[model samples]
Target: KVFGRCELAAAMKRHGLDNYRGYSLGNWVCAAKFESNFNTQATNRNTDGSTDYGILQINSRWWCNDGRTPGSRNLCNIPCSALLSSDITASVNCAKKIVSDGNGMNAWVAWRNRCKGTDVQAWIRGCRL
Candidate 1:
C-alpha cells in the first residue's frame, strides 16, 4: 500500500513526518493497528451510531470527501484534500504536522482516548524495528 511502510518512506521523505506526525512508526503503526490494522478496508461504528468507514474511519456524512473504496477509486479529479484528508498517508502526514506544530501527540494520542486501551503514548514511544 502507498500509505504503508514501503512507500511511506518516500512520502515521509517528501513530507518528513520526523518533524511532524508527532509519533514514530511503531506509534503510528500502533495507532494504525488499533484504528485499521494496516487494512485500508476497515470500518467501524462510532458512539453516535453513524458509520465510520474506510481506513481513516472517516464519517460518511461529515468528514468524507472520497469514495468508500480504498484509495477512493471513483474519484475523477482526486481532490488534493484527499492528499491530506482520507488517504492513510495523508492522514499520517497530517498527524506529523500536528505534532511538529506543537500539538504534541494530541492527534495520535486521542486514539487512546477514544478506544478503550492501554497507554496511547506507548504506541508512539517505542524504537523502530
Candidate 2:
C-alpha cells in the first residue's frame, strides 16, 4: 500500500520511529520519501546483484535473505519478501536494527545525500505527532 505524507508520518510514529535511534521523526520521514516514496512494495535491483526491498529498502546484502544473494549476512533473519508487506512490521523492525549500527541513519545513501544536512523537519510539515 502506498501512503500519503501525513499518513506515512502517522503510521511510522505509531510504530515508534520518532526517536528509534536518536534521529527525529523527520529523519525517518525523509528517508522513506526517498527510499520508496512511501510505497510498501518497492524494490530495487542493484547492478552488483543486491536487491533493496520495501519502503525502507532493507538490503539483501546484509539485512534480509532473498534466497538468492550470494554471501548474504541476512542479519535480520527475515525473508526479503516480508519487507514488502503492507503490514510494515518487518520493514520497521529491520529499520531499527539498521540504525543500531555505528552509522545510524547514515546507513542509507539517500538519507545521507537527501535527508541529511538539511532542514529535515520539512519532511514532516503538516503532520502532527
Candidate 3:
C-alpha cells in the first residue's frame, strides 16, 4: 500500500526510470501493477521453494535473502525486507541493478508475460508524471 498508480508513476519518474536502459516507465509501471499492485511489502511464494520480494517481486533465490533460503546470491546485498518499505528508493535502486545485469524489464517475469509487446503506454495514461 505504498502508492496509487499515479503517485507510483511520479515517484518512479523522479527515481530516474526514464533513464533506465532497455525499457520505458510504462513497462515498469505495468509490471509493478501485475507483480505487486504497488504494495511494497508484497510477497509471493513460488513452487520452486523460492519467494519473491517487494513491489518488483525480486526472487529470494538470487536477488535477496529470506533466511529460509541460505545459499542465495543476494546480489542486492540487502535484506528482502529493505525492499518492502513504503519508501521505494531501495527497491528502485535494486531494480536498476537487475536491469543492468541482464534483460532490462524482461528481467521481471511479470514484464515478460504481460508488458512485452503490449500497449504499455496505457499504464501511464492519465498519470501526470
Candidate 4:
C-alpha cells in the first residue's frame, strides 16, 4: 500500500497537521511502515487480548475510553482514540500527537521499527530517524 504524495498530504491536512510537510511526511511514513507494515487496516489482539484496531494499532480504549466504536468520527468529533480508524496519514498524525505530542519522533520511529521486525532501540541508534 504505497501512498502518493498527494494522498498523504490530504490525509495529513484532514488531521490538522500544520507542521512542515517535509518533516511530517517522511517521519510519519517511516513510523507507519514500522508500526503496521504500511497497512491502514492493521489490527492486533493485545497482551490482555483486546483487539487494538486500525493502521496505527491504537487501542480502542485509548481513543474512545469506553472501547465503543466511534464510526468515522475524527478527533474533533470524538476523542483521538476514535480517530484511529482514519487513513494512513491521519492515523499517523493522531499517533504522533498522542505519543510524542508533536515534539519528538521517538515514539513514531519506535512503532515503525517494532512493526518492521527491528529491535527498536538498536534501529534508533543505527537508523537515526
Quote each prediction's TM-score.
0.44, 0.96, 0.93, 0.48
Better of 1 and 2 by TM-score: 2
- Measured by lDDT, the strongest candidate is 2
Ten contiguous residues minimizing lDDT sum, candidate 4: 120-129
CA shift of 7, model 3, Å: 0.4
Score candidate 3 by lDDT. Answer: 0.87
CA lDDT of each prediction against the hidden true structure: 0.45, 0.91, 0.87, 0.47
In angstroms, the error of model 4 at 37 is 2.5
Q: Which ten residues in a row have the lowest lDDT in candidate 1?
A: 71-80
Candidate 4 lDDT by residue in tens digits, 10-117: 565466553443344444444555566645556665555444545555655444232444343333224433434544544555565465444455434444444334
lDDT of 2 by residue, 1-129 (tens): 998888988888899999887889999989999999999999999997999999998999999999889998999989999999989888988999999989999998899999898998898898776
Q: Please report, as a residue range, the 10-residue window in candidate 2 with the lowest summed lDDT.
A: 120-129
True-structure RMSD, every candidate: 7.4, 0.9, 1.2, 7.7
- Candidate 3: Cα lDDT at 112: 93
Error of 4 at 88 (Å): 5.5
lDDT of 1 by residue, 7-124 (tens): 4333443555543433444444445555565556665655654444434444433344444334332222333345333345655544444455454554343355653245534444
TM-score pick, better of 2 and 3: 2
Candidate structures ordered by lDDT, highest first: 2, 3, 4, 1
- TM-score for candidate 2, residues paired by index: 0.96
